[PDB]
Design a protein around this nucleic acid. Sequence first.
RNA 1: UUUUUUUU
Length: 849
Amino acid sequence: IRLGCNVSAPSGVLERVKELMEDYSRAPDAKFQQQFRHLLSVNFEEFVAETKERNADLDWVNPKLDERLQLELGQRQLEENAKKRLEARKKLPTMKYADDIIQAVRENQVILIVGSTGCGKTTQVPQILLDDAISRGCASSCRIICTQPRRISAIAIAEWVSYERCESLGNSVGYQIRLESRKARERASITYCTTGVLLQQLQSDPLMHNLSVLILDEIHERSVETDLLMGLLKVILPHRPDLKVILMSATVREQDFCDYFNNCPMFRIEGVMFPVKMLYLEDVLSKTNYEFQKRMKHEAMIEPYLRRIRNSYDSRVLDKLRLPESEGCEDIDFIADLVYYICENEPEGAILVFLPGYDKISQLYNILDKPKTSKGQRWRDHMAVFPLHSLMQSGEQQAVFRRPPAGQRKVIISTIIAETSVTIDDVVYVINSGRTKATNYDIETNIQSLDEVWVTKANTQQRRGRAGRVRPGICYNLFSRAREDRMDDIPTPEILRSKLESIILSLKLLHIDDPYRFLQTLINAPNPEAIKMGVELLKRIEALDQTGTLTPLGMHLAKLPIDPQMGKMILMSALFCCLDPITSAAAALSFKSPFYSPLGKESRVDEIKRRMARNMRSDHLMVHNTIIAYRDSRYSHAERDFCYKNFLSSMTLQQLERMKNQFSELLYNYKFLASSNCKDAASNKNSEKIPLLRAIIGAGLYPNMAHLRKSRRAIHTMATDDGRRVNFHPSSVNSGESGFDSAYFVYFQRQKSTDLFLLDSTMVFPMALIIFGDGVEAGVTQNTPYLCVAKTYYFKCNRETADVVIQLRSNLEKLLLKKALYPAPIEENGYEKQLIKAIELLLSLDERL
RNA sequence: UUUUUUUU
């Protein structure tokens, strides 16, 4: 072993820490504790038993309301601002099935509706179920929940359905998403929510007694949430004979779902869509006959196909198809050329280019903006070009959705983001390169990767769909039909790629204590070894004992709507009075960063960040400083001018702030704070003590450590605690920096792309790791006295410190156990604070001078 | 160097 720096502490510091610790050791409530032991002490049937009493509002109906609504439905359908849309709504395909759906719901607990774009299932099915109940004089027994994957969907659909009923939002229709609602009346109502909303409500209503019809939408996307929720319905439905579930799906492996609920009824409702012709690589080449400019397999693949098509393509269009580079988006000039070909032949209408990511979007944009080509600068000032990317701003504007200045043709360069999430309406032409990026997880290298791959059949049929919303259009797929037959049906179901810590933990609140056995029953079962890794992580942060059973701290973490590691971070920040900065770090990790990356300004966004970082060498503290600066700009009425000069999204910034306030109100209700204000003075008296902040951050992100080793932009020799070589991601504020006060870092996500990168990081000090971590041992290996952490990092430490530190840990552990089991704010002049002050004092030794 | 989404 090789020893790191000395962490020994001054005598007079040690002694005061010893006075403080013994002040803590001298001292001589519990509604939470009783809920905790109650959860552990009941079986499943008692659990089901008791959640039914406590949730029985729908057993009560209001007959005078049933009859009045029923009267006003019969009468509103004779008025006329209410049969335009009855005629209009009845020209949607779903309405042809109205009676048949009603009948199918009546006869079955679970039906499946399979539809496609335009079919109207999402807007009409809940209105058919509702109106059926009002008409039959059953209004008040009817509460309908329709889940969506996305926040924006939930809103727009609710508004539209509400508009179709000539009601303001809040009446028969509403929506609910994280921290924003327009709730509908309790009974005779339809509510559109994100799936995760419902899944959090399960904790209070684990058997869904508080709704009559559940409509799961868009399940074919195989999000973790709908996958989880279909798996839970298999537990819930046997004890809820009268609950109705309608599954709804696009035409993307529909039979899987049908098969999953024994073999339930299935409707196929058609979409409303213009014809779109599908040209493949051989056909695009055959019309542009562009030529290309300076592993096989690739003609092992391409040549049996090339024969079956000897007769029907030109001489050697068969050419380029032998070129590996002809497919995908290797050659951006090919693509730019196809943009030009569409610009002069084929009538007007926007072009939508699908490229795998930021880099290629950038190349193609520059090639149009400053062109080499003869047929480039003719067209330059007759194209309205927008790049479209999650990290770019143009999406959340409006200039991209409205049609172009006349004489100009709109061109959209985009990631997969325009497949479902973002919709442009004058698109007539789609160039589908067939290339995208996806995250992947190797289960026993622990490397998460970001890889360019071929799209799926599912992605292509959707992309094609995007061409035909306003008029017959065309989808150009820059790969060959031989490529397509190698392509997969659908993406990998995200639950097969995800970490399961929060899922395993949250199942405990639903009285599902065996994660292996429940998870195994999903449409696609996760690798059991991933589950194991999940459990060990929760065992390590002590959310579970080593039986696998919930700890008092684990219950608190389960109840916070954030990943457990960052929950632990937030609770700790309540104890050590640093709520505001840490909840910022927490919120930004959980959601995303408020910075754009607008094309070409990479260099000066880099410079904004480094300035916001204030030399604190922390991506996480940089976001907090950003929020501090944001708050002031608002106080100064300079909000827009601030967000503009600093490449920041004001709407990410506000959402970050609603999240922090959510964590502060929750922490108050759980009795960790005396105030629900995230900015409260008492809650924040240590929020400027940067070494302390680093410690609590480290407390959350532990055990993700990394250690930098050499000098020398600047080049780095850094390796995570597992031994693997990493570098700071260049988007991170620590990339290329030199002269850190410490060689140690914590990180939330590591990700392999061009290299194995730490996506985010905070410089931490050895003593902070040692106090809050584990694997702490005091020994002598050379003839030096050491003190270690995680049995991985060994620091020189005299033994008078090793002993105070080890005692400090023993006290820190006892205190944390007791705050979890009997939550109360830490009294400012009580015995517990003494121990807090003890820890603060040791950590202050590493203040930057 | 920067696929994308979500939380009573």
